[PDB]
Amino acid sequence: WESKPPPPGWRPKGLLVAHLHEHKSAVNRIRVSDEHSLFATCSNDGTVKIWNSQKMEGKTTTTRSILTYSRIGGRVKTLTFCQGSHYLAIASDNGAVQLLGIEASKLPKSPKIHPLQSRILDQKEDGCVVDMHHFNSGAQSVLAYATVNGSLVGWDLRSSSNAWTLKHDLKSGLITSFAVDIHQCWLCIGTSSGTMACWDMRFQLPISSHCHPSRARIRRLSMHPLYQSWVIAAVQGNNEVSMWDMETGDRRFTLWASSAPPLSELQPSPHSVHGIYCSPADGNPILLTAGSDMKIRFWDLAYPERSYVVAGSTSSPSVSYYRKIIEGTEVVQEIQNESLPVGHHDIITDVATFQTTQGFIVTASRDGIVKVWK
């Protein structure tokens, strides 16, 4: 799930660029620019911190957020970089939506273009939004926004019509996670009512045959490079990273690390990992997912123990990860092995990285922690 899949052998290392705590409240929404070298930072304080890699890295007096705009209000926990739309969509608790051309402040110190497109979505049907993704094809600009309350619809950034709607997955209920096909094939929605749901991208056909029966929360989505009919997802509890065959609609993949047994009914381990990043390389998918255990996760399938990851906990001997084959699939069990705490001290959720034979990665916590790893 990344352009120019890299060669095998990806392992992490102990380098970083900068750290920030500017966001007064928790930050749970970031956007990474495509045409440029910048990424967006927003916080539960209803304020968004814009950070430019070129400037924020160093060689400057202060690496403060370039574009800090709080006119949205509420809690800003929804942001996205519109695909070739020269607009940035932002969402806040108060059922409102914004699509601003804040890039207007690039060269001079001038007011950032307020939301070129904005809307206060229905408080009951959609609230403001739970999901929002824009589709770019040059000729048309279509962005798809989902709300926590079961509802899925798209909004063309260059069109007034908003008929692109997906009938609420009522059985799915909660709508807080969705997956996207790389070629606009189909979408899957991460929910928490136990059941899961999938959507098509050609005809937007609703396909609800996925689930984690325990009524578990699933907010993580990436396209499983292993099978176009397979997807990559992360769910809360037991440090779960599983791949689900949505035809069966259940996850069949593991890195088992949890007090809970595999697919444990009680899930004795409530810890999990999220913010997964997908790319095909080294004979299997190569992923970097935010480990809610604060385990900076550079994850491997064939040799998870053998490879190297960005996580901490130096007290653990050489990386320990179990590789198995279970009922037609290879199963993995993840097993564990003055000063100042370098690692984040909050519930880390977001990760973003850039490199070319070398580069940097961005990390954050559940309160505003900023970790810019090199």
Binding site: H21, E22, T62, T63, R64
Partner: peptide
């Protein structure tokens, strides 16, 4: 903090 405030990065002035």
């Amino acid at each position: 903090f405030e990065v002035r």
